[PDB]
Design a protein around this ligand. Structure first.
Ligand SMILES: Cc1ccc(C(C)C)cc1O
Ligand SMILES: Cc1ccc(C(C)C)cc1O
Ligand code: NA
Length: 123
């Protein structure tokens, strides 16, 4: 799996690909990585772009939870891995409450952060 430094480098590259498509500032993006979620549609759709870049958005506009779990297994350092997977399982039905795909990814991500803020990270 990646080290935490490598994981951050990977997340930074995903941010650098997706952030230009949305009216999202460093304050908004750093806050999001830190588990603070501005209620801003541009930030919600940024989270969907990140899920799309990870290849975890199906073409129906839903989150592929099994693919997300397989990525965390492969990529996350062990102090993060089992906790991230338990968070993902816990939050797997949040997306069913939202019609809009940017809502699905934003609120699913916020569920992961609330599950354990010390483990949580996001691009
Ligand atoms: C949404 C999302 C962000 C980062 C990663 C990797 C960098 C662990 C996977 C993923 O599915
Ligand atoms: C179940 C579930 C999958 C992916 C994500 C994020 C990583 C997009 C959150 C979540 O709660
Ligand atoms: Na856990």
């Amino acid at each position: 799996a990646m080290t935490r430094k490598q994981l951050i480098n990977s997340m930074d590259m995903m941010r650098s690909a997706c952030a230009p498509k949305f009216k999202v500032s460093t304050e908004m993006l750093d806050n999001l990585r830190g588990g603070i979620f501005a209620e801003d549609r541009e930030l919600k759709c940024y989270t969907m772009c990140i899920a799309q870049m990870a290849g975890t958005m199906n073409k129906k506009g839903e989150i592929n939870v099994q693919k997300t779990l397989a990525q965390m297994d492969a990529m996350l350092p062990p102090d993060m891995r089992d906790k991230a997977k338990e968070a993902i399982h816990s939050c797997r039905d949040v997306q069913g409450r939202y019609k809009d795909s940017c809502d699905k990814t934003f609120y699913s991500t916020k569920c992961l952060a609330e599950y354990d803020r010390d483990v949580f990270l996001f691009p």
